[model samples]
Target: EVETFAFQAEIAQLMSLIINTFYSNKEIFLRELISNSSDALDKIRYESLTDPSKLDSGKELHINLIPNKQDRTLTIVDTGIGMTKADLINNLGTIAKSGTKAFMEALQAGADISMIGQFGVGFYSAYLVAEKVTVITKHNDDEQYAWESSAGGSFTVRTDTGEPMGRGTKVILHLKEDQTEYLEERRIKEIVKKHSQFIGYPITLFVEK
Candidate 1:
């Protein structure tokens, strides 16, 4: 059965902060997302050192950015440690469950703006530019699944019967009308070079010839 979860009150508050605080420069959304992809890739690479049978074994760790101008969408694909259904619920449903109280207290105490992602709220930045976000992901131990959210304090997850990702995650952003700038090749390339050039994984932009 498909499952749905609501964000905690604290999560809603944090989301408000992220959206409002970064309203002037929503481009940071891409940077935060790509940084997350790199971290996931790094995680899988590190785990593979112990278990050779990890997802997408023998495949190169990489990130792909594909923009669909017609659909007004931007997709970020990564060969990395994908999330399971439980992971989706736990990680996305509960905000900073690892340290919710601490994170909230820190934020209220004037936490450094640079520490925004340190509290695990980076993903919320997607809402700044996307009206809706869908994640298609596959993990070695879990079947492929799709998670969808409009960031209205709730989200849903279900098994993905369309196509298998083999491994890793793909995030599709339904760009807001004003955020279509993310769909331009030059803009995406510039953002990647500016924020993620030093990332360990090879980042590629897909465009039709």
Candidate 2:
């Protein structure tokens, strides 16, 4: 089954404003996404310490980056704390309206856009570079689900059956023409090292020969 939801009234305008205002610091887009993945990995590892069943039957814990030259997509996959349908609808559907209001104001004030301890809206920062986004997630109790959206007024969530994955999340960013540099190995290595050099889990990049 599939369902589509409109963002909070301000999200379309907010996302557009954000994308237009923030691409100058596009480093944050990659950094923020990787940070989100690392946070998920942290959650699963910590939970497994108390309840070993949370580890998903020996599924290794790590984040993998797979860049598809053909499709012009960059996929970030994490074997970590996946989200439920409710989580996807609730989290991605309603971004912090108040939070974005302030981000815009902060931009206007020429303040540095350091939002790490600020809020959950950094996921939207990916909009600065991607033409579209797809998130496939599998939780322990739920079937795999794909949440997809472009920079638009709405987003869609549906059960995913085409490509199977273990318990985790996969975020695929369809890069825009000017922003495709992130898919390059040289650039990825530099940005990842500059931003997430100390991330706990090994960040692996898979290349197809």
Candidate 3:
């Protein structure tokens, strides 16, 4: 059976919140994303115990950061359980699913959002640090796909034919001049430790100086 999902209108509001408020420290975008990546790695680790064949043991659960200063591009890659095309669109593009709608409604009804970070569109925070973002993912369930967005209003996704990672995702961020702060390794590590120390996975940040 195939499961269906959709993003709620309130998720639009949630996107706005992250874009406008939630994070005053734009640098923490690295932390937020790394924390999310950690969760992804953890999810795969937990699943692998039962399904050892779920992923190649060679693909460890860790974070890979690639910073291309010449092109002003920074990429964060991970070898976790990759996402199917449906999962990519449904999960990364929007958060209007049934349960998500209920969650959004409750939050708007004045429920505390202190724990909101644990749910909904948290991945979209990547826009705060990137002008254009590209995601290359291959899942155990399906073929590889690429999800790209310019942080404008709409996003584009297509098939990817690059080197396959066996299983995982590689997010490339084309940085704007103003977003150069994210290219710094020390700065990124500090932010990661501060916001993602609790992420429960090893995070290895890399850059070319």
Candidate 4:
């Protein structure tokens, strides 16, 4: 019940180029990801206007950061309107397609405009610190699925039949060898408060099990 999809056009060559160009300030990617999840929170809030069941009855709407030292991964979990399989492909794949190339060219040409408005290529910025990134997500309207990539030319998405989780998208960053500083709770909080303190949802950093 799953397979791999090529990133639109030449993302393999372009992604690494952009990552290296702007990654001197690797902080931009994290800002984009956190803001990206807040957009999801906003989407669910909007969806609830039409469908009462849109909100997960069991969980309050919020964002969570789980930094695991042993595993060398940082998980960003969002209690929001998660994606369907098609949404994942369209938003992350083509969105990655449209966004990165344009921004990289603009930066190369030195112009100014909006930050990313959707999942787009901004999610791929995890590569600023991760050798790999995995997304586990469940929408109120669709079955759970897992998406995985190494910022390569392609990514894999499959039916996730593991221990089921509640509705939301969970992004796991398998950190790179020299990127262990990202695992620090202090560093993450700095990023969240600096970039997203005014985000609509209260952000939580858990030392909980």
List the candidate 3 regions with Cα displacement exceeding 4 Å: 1-17, 20-23, 93-116
* Tens digit of per-residue lDDT, candidate 4, span 26-140: 6556777777788887888888888877665435788888888989898898887888888887745245665666766775576432343332566767777888889998888
The digit string of per-residue lDDT tens for model 1 on 1-209 reads 78888877776666666656644667878888888898889988989988877744437799999999888899999988888888787764235655455666786798743455676667767878888999998877788999988766888899998776878889999998988989988999998988887998889999953
TM-score preference between candidates 2 and 3, better one: 2
> lDDT, candidate 2, residue 131?
84
> Which parts of model 4 have CA positions greater than 4 angstroms off?
56-59, 111-120
lDDT of 2 at 174: 94
Candidate 3, position 206, lDDT: 71
- The superposed Cα distance between candidate 3 and the true structure at residue 56, in angstroms, equals 2.9
Window of ten residues with lowest summed lDDT in model 3 = 1-10
CA-RMSD of model 2? 2.1
**Residue pairs in collision within model 3:** 6-96, 6-97, 7-95, 7-96, 8-96
Task: State which candidate has the highest TM-score.
Answer: 2
Candidate 3 lDDT tens digits, 1-209 = 22223334554455555456554456655665666576667778888889888766345777888887888888888887778888787756344454345556666787543334455545666767677778888777778788776643455667777776777778888887888877888877777767777766666777575
Q: What TM-score do all the candidates reach, one by one?
A: 0.88, 0.90, 0.79, 0.87
Residue 199 miss distance in model 1 (angstroms):
0.4
Candidate lDDT (C-alpha), each: 0.79, 0.80, 0.68, 0.75
Top candidate on lDDT is 2
- Write the candidate numbers in order of decreasing TM-score: 2, 1, 4, 3
